[PDB]
Symmetry: C3
Subunit: 111 residues, 3 copies
């Protein structure tokens, strides 16, 4: 039917940990991720993306090629619809945060 | 025909390195990556995924929509098969580690 | 026409914060990203990839399965041309930097 994307935030801190004999140290990463990151559609069909923002703050969802640029508030849901009338690969990104904190995804429009 | 995915772990620490005049300082990133992250199939076909675990620890490979939940031991290869009976975009993730340490991928089932 | 990929570097340092009583340890993330990261093409396609390198350093673009392996200088734009003669999923990666700094992408054929 329609796509389902969940936006999650992760605050990871692992000073030291032995995982199956392997010790990992000084890990510190904070990120926001769109799950899933990639969406593939056929050129022409209308797209419906139900974005559920589970992040503690407002998150962005943009796709330049199709004038898509929304802002979903914390704990809110938002259906984003548009028509992929152009072929190619387009970056799905958050216009609100650093791109290497809230990692971008991809909208692929096949011929 | 048959997908090939390699799971790799990276333990990266760079105190300070000047590359072509640009300073790359205080880098500390630990991640596990599925190479490649995205698999694109068509609704209906029988998917075959040969997953080779090059990570020094056990790694997970999960895709809820198709009941896929596997653990690949360090240095082992496991072929994962399932039918993509439904269209859409589904997250490929590890159920053992933090999603922003072991970055997730996507299974795209197209009509 | 063809694919347009922009390569960007992110040098991100964020001091410790306290958001709604919740403390967030200082963050430090340095990455290089291909935007877009994924390319889906039909088998037998004469793929054209215009790669604009916005990174301040040389960036690599490789896809083993098709002999693709180029080095794009900082600020330059290079067009990659090859034919996707094989179906499957192939990693788009940079042979110059650690894979978890410059995150890999994917070339999907059919
Ligand atoms: Cu964001
Ligand atoms: Cu993992
Ligand atoms: Cu690079």
């Amino acid at each position: 039917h329609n796509f389902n994307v969940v936006i999650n935030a992760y605050d990871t801190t692992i000073p030291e940990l032995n995982v199956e004999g392997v010790t990992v140290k000084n890990i510190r990463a904070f990120n926001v991720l769109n799950e899933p990151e990639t969406l593939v559609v056929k050129k022409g069909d209308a797209v419906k993306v139900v974005v559920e923002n589970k992040s503690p703050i407002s998150e962005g969802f943009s796709i330049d090629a199709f004038g898509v640029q929304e802002v979903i508030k914390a704990g809110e849901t938002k259906t984003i619809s548009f028509t992929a009338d152009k072929a190619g690969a387009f970056t799905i990104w958050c216009q609100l945060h650093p791109k290497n904190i809230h990692l971008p995804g991809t909208l692929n429009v096949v011929e």
